[PDB]
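Hi D.,

Good news: the full-assembly prediction came through. Inputs first.
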Amino acid sequence: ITPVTVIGLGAMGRALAGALLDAGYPTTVWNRTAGRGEDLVARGATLAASPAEAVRAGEVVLVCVVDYAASQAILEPVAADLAGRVLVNVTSDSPERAREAAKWADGHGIRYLDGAVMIPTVMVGSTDALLFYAGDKSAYDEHEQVFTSLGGQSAYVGADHGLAAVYDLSMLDFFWTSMSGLVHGYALAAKDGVPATSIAPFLKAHISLLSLLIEVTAKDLDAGEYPGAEGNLAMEVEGIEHILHAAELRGLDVSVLRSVRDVARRAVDLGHGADSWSATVEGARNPA
Amino acid sequence: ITPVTVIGLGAMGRALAGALLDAGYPTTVWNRTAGRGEDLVARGATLAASPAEAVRAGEVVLVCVVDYAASQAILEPVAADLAGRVLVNVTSDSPERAREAAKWADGHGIRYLDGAVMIPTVMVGSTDALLFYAGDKSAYDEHEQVFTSLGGQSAYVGADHGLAAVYDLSMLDFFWTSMSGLVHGYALAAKDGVPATSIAPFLKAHISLLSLLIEVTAKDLDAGEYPGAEGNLAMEVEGIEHILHAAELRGLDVSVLRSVRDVARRAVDLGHGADSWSATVEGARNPA
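Then the structure:
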């Protein structure tokens, strides 16, 4: 049974370690701070005396630290013990930093996978949990069931180590922009005395609509062609302006909605008024 | 049995008329420019010679004229023939416009419903389609089947006529902001060569996350209290800055992300650094 090591025992590291134990993998864990975790040891993890001892206990070493820099600082003293093992970094980092980490791993003879966790800690280890991995293909294929244990929707996205961070930041762009809109829509409703939980049941219809548009928008963006008949951007800009003005009249900050409107307007200025919302990608790509 | 009239045969007016015909209602249609209704007439709609003739043919009168001034210009000459009928304005614009239109209707003794269509035209008439209505409750109760014909999830949201626009614009605030993030996320991935249709299958994970957060966020905002168990807003603002930095480096317009960030930073400056994302509502409500 493949021995696995987890370095970094913040909440995400602890969740990863816990998923491995539920799967039945022998797990060794190490943290800079003594007080961290110890629930895992009760469930059978071995706490290691030193990062080197933790690396030596693992065929796969998972690092989940604060910053890319912190991971290099922990890892670079233990490079010698990592040689010939599999290193997976799920630390949130930029594509540039993942690729630099890949160069470092190559210089030390480490098969390296850059990973990203896309779900909250609570769902880590569940059949529907999504993680991305990029880098050494043999490392992923050899330890696929380990990675399936951390989340059943684990996906390898390619050999370029930066791609895990690319998928992560692209999905996070969508997520946090939608959470900003979610808070704003509720604030707009509250300005007229409507409780947020009165709006919430209805937002489900727009959840179903967004799921449909995910697939449609991707395929327009890949085609490079945006089709007008289902909806026209010119009229969509006018609809968004009604939101912008009502929220502004009510004293809300409207910087997000105005920014949404300007990008779409710019795509109209570039000639896409009869096209669908997908054409707004041209405003995002060619700001004035 | 109930005769229905549709005034204005743009795409939305046409979809509404088609939905009433699918349900078997006797439908009379009118447009200011000729030849809009020929497909509708072939399926049994009656074209009216004049707006006054059209109004007189329908117990329920749906007005789907996009331009406010143009719609008022048709309606005020037929005010006397609208007496004793039910007038439904299916338009977006603002709650204030609905309240103004309601005052006009009240002086003329017209029972008035302000309506908002929350789904694309192709979905109008579907059992799943969501439409909002506000205004005269006895009018809505008497013609509920006609409104259910237009969309099976038709919902009456209250007697103040402006409330349909409140629910509509609030939901649209979330929807169009999320569509902006969706295009922007796809654009970010494409700068690194990732096709949009490679990301699209994964976005389902973030959609179901959003569905849960819709309720959690609503309850926080109604409570006026935003504890964050695992995430500090201060740390969430830093995460947002890494998306912003990656997209800005790649040459994208990042207006929306910067605005999202600025509203959240304002909430930190207002004292919510230790709170959850729901506390960003304080930033939206008290811009610097």
